[PDB]
Amino acid sequence: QINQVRPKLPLLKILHAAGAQGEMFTVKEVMHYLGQYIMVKQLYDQQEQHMVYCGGDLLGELLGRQSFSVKDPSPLYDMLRKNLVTLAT
Numbered sequence: 363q364i365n366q367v368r369p370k371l372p373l374l375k376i377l378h379a380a381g382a383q384g385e386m387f388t389v390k391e392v393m394h395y396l397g398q399y400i401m402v403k404q405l406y407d408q409q410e411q412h413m414v415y416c417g418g419d420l421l422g423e424l425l426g427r428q429s430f431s432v433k434d435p436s437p438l439y440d441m442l443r444k445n446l447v448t449l450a451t
């Protein structure tokens with residue numbers, strides 16, 4: 363209810379697969395369900411949780427690659443800006 367916008371359609375399918383329902387979502391509203399999705403699907407390595415391997419996911423089939431490290435916010439913001447539709451650049 364923060365006058366927020368809609369994400370990319372495969373992101374909305376990943377949110378539905380997490381058990382959610384929606385149209386408009388913030389990065390925080392996405393993340394609540396995306397952390398839950400990655401945990402229930404196990405899209406991470408138990409020993410290196412600082413990486414997620416979405417290149418094998420719908421996020422990967424959309425972007426051609428979506429495997430990344432969570433410790434590096436700059437390339438992560440560049441990916442987010444393509445998967446959650448917004449301003450910038």
Ligand SMILES: COc1cccc([C@@H]2N=C(c3ccc(OC)cc3OC(C)C)N(C(=O)N3CCNC(=O)C3)[C@@H]2c2ccc(Cl)cc2)c1
Binds near residue numbers: 389397
């Ligand atoms: C700005 O938007 C973000 C984008 C990417 C990452 C983050 C955040 N970084 C981590 C996280 C960080 C470190 C880590 O391990 C060292 C594990 C993490 O969780 C993933 C494995 C799900 N995320 C988590 O969900 N967490 C971190 C906090 N505690 C948890 O149990 C789960 C967030 C996340 C992950 C993926 C997405 Cl698509 C969205 C949100 C925010």
